[PDB]
Structure formats: C-alpha cells, structure tokens
Design a protein around this nucleic acid. Structure first.
Lengths: 116, 177, 50, 66, 136, 75
RNA sequence: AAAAUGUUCA
RNA sequence: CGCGGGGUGGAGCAGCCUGGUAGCUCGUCGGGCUCAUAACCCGAAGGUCGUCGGUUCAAAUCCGGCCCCCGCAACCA
RNA sequence: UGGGGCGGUCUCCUCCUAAAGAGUAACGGAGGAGCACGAAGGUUGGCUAAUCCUGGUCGGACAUCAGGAGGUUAGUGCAAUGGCAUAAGCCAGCUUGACUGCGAGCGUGACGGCGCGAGCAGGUGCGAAAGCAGGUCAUAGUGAUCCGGUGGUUCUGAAUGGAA
RNA sequence: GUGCCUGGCGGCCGUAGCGCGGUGGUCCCACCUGACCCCAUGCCGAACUCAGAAGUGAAACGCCGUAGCGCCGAUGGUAGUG
RNA sequence: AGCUAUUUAGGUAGCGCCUCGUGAAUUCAUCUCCGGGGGUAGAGCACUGUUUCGGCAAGGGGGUCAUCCCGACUUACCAACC
RNA sequence: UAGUCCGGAUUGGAGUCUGCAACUCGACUCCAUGAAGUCGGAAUCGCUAGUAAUCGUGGAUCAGAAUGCCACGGUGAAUAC
C-alpha cells in the first residue's frame, strides 16, 4: 500500500517532534494540490493553514500541481504565521522525501522569514 | 510496441462485451513480465553465471538482476547469500516490445510446437509458461553458446480470475491447445 | 583470542595515541581513523603501530 | 532506465516465408531473415493435419482388395 | 502404560496437590467413575484398572480414559546417601483431585457398567464412586 | 551437572507512582523496554529509564498497541 | 632365485 | 551404584580431533595362468558409521538419552 | 564435602526454585562465556518476515521466478530471558562520537568496585533542517596490589648545573 | 439557524478490529496519461519523482446496512486468601 | 548464631543486631483515605510443550493384483493438519 | 583427421519371394533412424612360402534360410643370428 507505507515512514519523524514540544510545519503532497498547515505543540489545534484549494492562492496559478505552485504556498505560510508572530518552527516531511515539490515549499518558507 | 496500440482499440472493446464490464477500468491490463533464468550451477563456475547473464541480457533489452539465495539449502549445497538466479522485469513499452516479440517471432521457432497450455495459470489471471531452449530468440547467433539456456516467462495481469486472464490472451490470439 | 592490540599513533606533532585491537588475520593494511588529538585540539589522522 | 548498462535499441527489420514486412525494435543490431511468423503459422490448421490415426480397415482393405 | 511422548523437561518439582478437580461433569460416555479421595494415580494403576473393566464388558463398547500421567516422579537408588543430585525418573503419576472423572463408558447397560467400575475401583488407590452423565 | 548461577542484578521499579524525583534519578531498571519512555524521561543504553526533569512520576498506558509509559510532571 | 598338492576301489 | 574408552564393508583396523569427501589388509565376485587346486597376475563390487532425539545450511564427526562390550575403582574401622 | 578418600565443583551471564518490590539456600532442575566487528559502529534515506498452496526449463519435498494465504509462528554474530515494525530486524550512500576534558542527580555493593546519566566546554561527522552520535537491542567475553618495561611531560632531582 | 460530504492532524486504543452486501466521484481522493530533463531501480516510471490531466469509480479509500466472528461483559456462586 | 570475603568453613574482617555519649528534622511506627508497579495463589489453553476421543483427512503399513508402462481395489489397521 | 560423407547395431513404416502357413521363428529390398566402437587389461593364437595377410567367385545340404563348412583364383610380404 502506497498510503500506509508513507504513514509508518512519517511516524518516526513525528514521534520525535511531538516529544520535543515543538510547533510543527506539516505538508501533505497530492497529485493535484499541496497542503501546508502549522500545528501547535499540543497536537489538536492548528494555527496557520494554507493550501492550493484556497481560492486566494488557486486563482493566481496555472495548475495547482507543480513546484512553482508550492513555491507560492510556502511563501503564504510564512506570511500568515508572522501575523501570529511565529518565527521558530519545526519541519515534518510527513512521509515525503525532501526532494521536489516539498523542497520548493520549504525554501520559500525559509526565505520568507519562517526559520525552521 | 504496436501490440500496445492493438490493446487500446481491439482488445478493450472485444472484452467489454465478453464478460459485460460496466467500466473501462475493469478490463484486465498486462502488468509486467518476469524473465527468470535459474542457472543453479553458478557455484561450479563464476563465469558460468556471466555467460548466463550475457545471454539473458540479449533476450531482454536490459541488464538483469543477480538474485541470490533467500534461505540456505544443503540439498543443493548453497549458503544464505549465493547468486543462483537471474531475473529482469520488463515493464511499460519494452514490456510490450518483448510481449509482441515473443508471440510473432519466438514461439514459431520452438521445435515441435503443438500449442501452449491453458492450464499454466496459477489462479489469479497471471500466466506463467516455461521455454526450454532460449535459441528461439534471434539475439543468440547460435555460434557463441554452449549451454541449454532455459528461462521462465511469467506474465502478471490485473485480472481477478484465471479464466479472465485466459480470454485476455485470446484477444492477442496467444497460441494454446 | 586471535585479536591482538595495536597503538594508533597520531601523525601530528605529539606522541599521543589511542589503544585498540585489530584482526591481524583479515586486515593487511593499517588502521586509519581521524580522531581528536587532546593537545593541539583538532582532528588529525591516527595511523596504527604496536 | 539508468544509462550505460543496458544494450542498444534499434528498430530492426524481420522477414518471413509469407513476406511479412515486420519492423520490431530489438537489441540485435543486425537484419533478421526468418522463416516462420504468426502470419505463416504452421499451427492454426496444423492440428487437423496432425492426427490421422484411428483407421486400419480401409488400410486393411487394400490387401483384401475386394 | 501411558507415558508422555517426548516431554519438555526431564525431571520435575514435587509440588502440592490442592483444590477441587476440573473435569467434574461426564462429557463423552454415559457412565463414569469419579474420584472422591485425594491422591496420585501412577501409570501402572491406570493401565491395570483399564484391563479390569475391558474384561467386564468382554471387549465391547467405548472406554474413555480422561486422566493422563504427565508428571515424572523420580527416585534414588537403593541404599545411597542423601544429596549429590536429584533422583532418576522411575514412574509417572497423575495428581488426582476430588471430583475428577477418571473413566467414561458407553454402549453397555447401567447394571453392567456399575459392575465394571466396581472391578476397576478395586485396583485404584483413591476411593472412587460411580457417576452418570446428566443433561447440562 | 548443574550448580552454576548468576548473581542478581537488583532490577525492578526504583521509584513508584506519585513519588517526587530529582533530575537524573533512576525510575526503573528494566531489562528490555518493558516500560517505554513517556514525557521528561530518557532511555539509557542499559534501557534504564531515568528522569530528565525533577518532578512527579506518572505511570500511564498510551499507544495503539497499548504500552506502558512513564512520564513526569514539571513539579 | 621361486617352484607345494593330486580321495577309495578297479 | 561410580569412572575412561569403544561399536564403521563379511573379519580385524584407520578416518572424528579442526563437521561437508568413508580408506586399509584379508576375505568375495569375474577373467587369466595350470591337466585340476593352491599360489601368483588383471578388473570390479561390497559399509548411509549401534540406535533415538536435538543442534547447524550440513552429522562418521558435535551434544544428550539408551544398549552391547572392554578396562578401572569398590579404601579407612 | 549430608564423616574422610575417590568423582565433581570453585569466576562470570540467563531462566526456575524465589512465596506478584529487591534479595534469598542445597553436591536442587536446565543452558552458556574466557570472544567477535573496521564494520556487525555513527548517521541519513528506504525496506520489512517464517511456513505453506497454485503456476513455471533443467529442478525433485526445498535452489532462483510470479501470485495468493498468512501474519512475525522470522530475524537479531553466540545461551536464555526480557525487548523490538517509530523497528533494536534488512539494503545502500556518506563518514569515524569506537572523541578529549567534566559531569547535577540516582542505582547497587561491608568495602575494593561497578552501572545509568541530562547537561557544560572544545573540536568532528550525518542530515535541508528538527535533531542524532562519547561504541554494538540489553544482560556474559574478565582479574586487585607490588615489581619491571616503552612513550610523553624539565614536576622532582640530596653542594651548584645536568643526568640516572 | 445549520445539516449531510470530503482531506489533513490529533485524542482515545478492538463496544473502535475482520467478514458479507450495497454505495459515492460536481468537488475532495485514488487510479490514471506521459517522462527529454530534476530523481530513482543493487534489473524495471513497480516504488521513488517530475510534468499534467482524457477517462474511471474496477481496485483502494470513505459512508451505510448486516452480529457470521474477534471484541466488551454484569448479578450470583465458586477458587484463593489477610 | 544473618550477609560479604577469606588455603576460608569450630578463626577473622566490614556491615546488620546490642550498649554508652552527643546533635537533629511529628523524622519513625500502627490505622483510615489516596497514588503506584507488579504476576505468585487461583484460573485458563491463543502461545511454548503435553493429552484423549469424535469429524474431515492427506499421508501410511500390509494385502489382491495388470502380477509390464498405467493404476485399482481392499484393509486385519496406523495417521498430521484445521 | 572429425564420432567425422567413419561405423553399422537398433528401431518405425512400406514391400518382394519361397512355402498350406513367416505370430512365436525366414531371407531380402526401400526410406528414415543411426548406438557401441578411436587399436583393446592380465593373457593368448596362426604362419616361412606364392605361405601370412587381403579381395572376390562357386559348391554341397536346400522350397526358402549361413558371417559356418568344402573348394578356386587375383594381389602378395616380413623374418629365420
């Protein structure tokens, strides 16, 4: 199974972060759309959420399934988090190899002020 | 790879009115084919394995993987981790390139041909046959071999029942008895 | 047992060394480890000796 | 398909006793002149001309002759 | 003479024999031989008791033996001093608790079985009584 | 023959539920991971669970496979 | 140099 | 009770020790030499290691259980 | 030492005895250790069994191949127990933290001694980074003191300066 | 006023999991089309990955009905016991 | 009249236990309430082993043979797995 | 210079003839198939001249059926201290 294989890949990274009391920036990659939400250390309530399903982001793109789409998405998560005053956060690959679209999202967030 | 084009028009329509599928995605697709070539006697000589791998590389269009012993067997005297077989998994275009290159070129060259078996299905719509001589593939010029290179060809499809795998090959007029 | 001891001496300007063992009957070459040199405070190469 | 380990792919040509203009890709790097193909199959009708045993009466009647 | 075919360990602790039995109700045959007195039945005693009732019914019916030894009782050699190792296994007993159905029979009449178990009981060390299979 | 045996390792739980511990105090000297690390605790190489923060011991049963965890409140 | 033996009667 | 060692072609012995292969002389079978036998010469066969359980990928071999056999000890009042 | 002799044993690790904290005896019941590794260590990324059933050249109960059931009955350098898929099990890339000076605070011992250890300073390596790493899934693989040897450090050096 | 949908992240860890039957695709999801390059296979676009999106609801996933099972489980009595 | 070590086992050394001196915290003890980890007694048989019967049942032994390739039948009867 | 266009056993099919009759059990022809066998262990046998060796022909018995037997000729040695 594609799904659950990815989830047991994500557990190690997640268990370590949920025991360091760190705010986490999680990312769910899908063939058509990319998700990026910031979760508080308690684990239940999120703080900042931004994805390619939101019109305010989806409208200015061409297609919501590429690097540049996520590059704009990573930008947004750092901007929304800074109105909340969130600078230091932690990153979770969530089972995705840090290589393409997720990598594009991350560096856009790093150059947007969100230092993780 | 023109047989793949055959699939996209001829096969699919001939199948939806044969078992009455309500969807185009429910008809069987040929997933992959695995050309396994058990050498076994590679413990007798290491270049015996190299000659074996070179011939298998000719049959397919790529370098095969040197498989090893899953468990240690003393019946045939092999420790845990001894290269004893060679396999390669044709997938995609080259899989189709090979599939057609077998039914329109190779099988006609099988000495004393009388048709394959429709009982070679394991029970999941996956066909698995076995050639004795590898000589039926024009790659080997005959004057370079020295061993009777036998290899198994096992086709894995998306069919759910063995009889559905059967009629799938009937669309390609896969010779049987 | 079969594993005898060697003295990893530094290639730096000191006579400092690390002691360890080595399987003399499987390893023909000398051991090479970039260890800390507790005198000049830096990582140097420690080639083996006896 | 990582490079430098897999042999070449050229669109080779194949002939037949049927005159089959067959162009298939392979790793030969030659020109194949074949006798039998799926269009000059010795099988499709070879079955009926394979079994002809189960008769000896007419065979025997050639000796009785009457 | 019943004996465990290839047991896990060779010798065993003595232990105590307490509590009421488990196989209280008759579940296979129609008549049984429930134990009332506490004690241990050796393999030779179970074997002997079986022959006692197999002759009583001549050969017929089914005779279930619901108890098995499975407990090696060791023993030292004659005239040896104490210590220097545990004894060597001699026989196999089966700890019996009150309320344990030792045997079960079927096919023969009640008079015959009550007479058959009478012979069987005369061979066993523990005081045994006759019991029958009831519904539920 | 027999008669050979090993000297006891004095294992078990050193500090029980509700006890006030100091940072670095050993909670349980288990062998394997009979008790997993909860919060504010570290698992040593001997698999010895100690306190990474002085507080109060909190035994719990969390996890999908229902395992025992030893957490510690910041007291 | 080595080099033994040959049932009883007729 | 206790202790050491041993059992392998039909007979008497190697091989174990450091596990993956069973050798040796006689005997035996067939041919040859001789009038025939012996002797001599040539060629070949024949033993899953006492037995059972486990260990390892693998047991003649390692470990344990049992039998047969041989040797050894059975001293002090 | 269930009188002494003979046989056996003497140190260390695992289970049981051991009576649900620890500990707990006998010539009580079962087994093992006197090492191994340059990677079988560190780290990042990925993968996850055994055994059966069906089909398939040589090929058979079992070589390698594909599929299904199954579910950790597998594996973990070694005995057993505890533990492990977040895998500690399996594969590859990159390296040496198998690092120096310390170490709050506890565990365990009559003591000698032994064990765990967050964190601090230096410097290193893996990862984008969060973090991780001062040996190895843990528990055996080991012997005090004296005496003497080799290397380093001017600390000392019996008149002073050296040297032993 | 809200309700039914769906994806993600957790809480709680089988009254929550299997099995059987049905069912959903405008969205979301999955499969999927393609791959010169980023990247990958100890062989292979299977996976990983990127570029895209015709087609589909088969598989997978989710939701509902069903107790054939797993599971949860009194009262009382019994065992044990200070 | 215990532990640990001992050419040590009827000796000795440290600790435990006694006594005297001195200083200190409701410090210590019994009980009720509360928070705990256990895994023994008992019980159970999913697990590691062991056991009986019944059902299904490969496989199996011996027979009758076609006394050839094939295979069948029968059975005084043994039997895993679920 | 090879299991070779060597070698021909064997086997399947198809026929001819003799003879009441060819299955047990004939000879021969045709096609196909095409093994063992590469100079032979210990040991043993024949021969001195037109002999050895090698090639082919005929006869008796006989319906048919010999690579045996009896008989003939072609080619034709070496060696005997």
């Amino acid at each position: 199974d594609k799904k659950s294989a990815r989830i047991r890949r994500a557990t190690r990274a997640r268990r370590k972060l949920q025991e360091l009391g760190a705010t986490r920036l999680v990312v769910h990659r899908t063939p058509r759309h990319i998700y990026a939400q910031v979760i508080a250390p308690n684990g239940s309530e999120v703080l900042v959420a931004a994805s390619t399903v939101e019109k305010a982001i989806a409208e200015q793109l061409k297609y919501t399934g590429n690097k540049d789409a996520a590059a704009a998405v990573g930008k947004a998560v750092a901007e929304r988090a800074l109105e909340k005053g969130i600078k230091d956060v932690s990153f979770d690959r969530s089972g995705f190899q840090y290589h393409g679209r997720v990598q594009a999202l991350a560096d856009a967030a790093r150059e947007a002020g969100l230092q993780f | 790879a023109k047989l793949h084009d055959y699939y996209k028009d001829e096969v699919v329509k001939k199948l939806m009115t044969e078992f009455n599928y309500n969807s185009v995605m429910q008809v069987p697709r040929v997933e992959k084919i695995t050309l396994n070539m058990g050498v076994g006697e590679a413990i007798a000589d290491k270049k015996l394995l190299d000659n074996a791998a070179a011939d298998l590389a000719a049959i397919s269009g790529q370098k095969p993987l040197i498989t090893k012993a899953r468990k240690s067997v003393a019946g045939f005297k092999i420790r845990q981790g001894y290269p004893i077989g060679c396999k390669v998994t044709l997938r995609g275009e080259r899989m189709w390139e090979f599939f057609e290159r077998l039914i329109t070129i190779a099988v006609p060259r099988i000495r004393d041909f009388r048709g394959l078996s429709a009982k070679s299905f394991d029970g999941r719509g996956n066909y698995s046959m076995g050639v004795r001589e590898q000589i039926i593939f024009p790659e080997i010029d005959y004057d370079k071999v020295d061993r009777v290179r036998g290899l198994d060809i096992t086709i894995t499809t998306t069919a759910k029942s063995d009889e559905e795998g059967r009629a799938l090959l009937a669309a390609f007029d896969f010779p049987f008895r | 047992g079969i594993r005898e001891k060697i003295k990893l001496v530094s290639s730096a300007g000191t006579g400092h060394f690390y002691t360890t063992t080595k399987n003399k009957r499987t390893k023909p070459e000398k051991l090479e480890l970039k260890k800390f040199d507790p005198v000049v405070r830096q990582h140097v190469i420690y080639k083996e000796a006896k | 398909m990582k490079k430098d380990i897999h042999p070449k792919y050229e669109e080779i040509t194949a002939s037949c006793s049927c005159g089959n203009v067959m162009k298939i890709r392979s790793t030969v790097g030659h020109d194949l002149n074949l006798d039998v193909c799926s269009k000059c199959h010795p099988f499709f009708t070879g079955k009926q001309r394979d079994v002809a045993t189960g008769g000896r009466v007419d065979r025997f009647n050639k000796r009785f002759n009457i | 003479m019943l004996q465990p075919k290839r047991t896990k360990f060779r010798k065993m602790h003595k232990g105590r024999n307490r509590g009421l039995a488990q196989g209280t109700d008759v579940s296979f045959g129609s008549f049984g031989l429930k134990a009332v007195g506490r004690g241990r039945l050796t393999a030779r005693q179970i074997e002997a008791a079986r022959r006692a009732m197999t002759r009583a019914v001549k050969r017929q019916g089914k005779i279930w033996i619901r108890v098995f030894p499975d407990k090696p009782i060791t023993e030292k050699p004659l005239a040896v001093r104490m210590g220097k190792g545990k004894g060597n296994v001699e026989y196999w007993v089966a700890l019996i608790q009150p309320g344990k159905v030792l045997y079960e029979m079927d096919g023969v009449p009640e008079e015959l079985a009550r007479e058959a178990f009478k012979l069987a009981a005369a061979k066993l060390p523990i005081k045994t009584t006759f019991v029958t299979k009831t519904v539920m | 023959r027999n008669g050979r045996d090993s000297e006891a390792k004095r294992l078990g739980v050193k500090r029980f539920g509700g006890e006030s511990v100091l940072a670095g105090s050993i909670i349980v000297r288990q062998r394997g991971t009979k008790f997993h690390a909860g919060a504010n605790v570290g698992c040593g190489r001997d698999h010895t669970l100690f306190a990474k923060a002085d507080g109060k011991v909190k035994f719990e049963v969390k996890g999908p496979k229902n395992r025992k965890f030893i957490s510690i409140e910041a007291e």
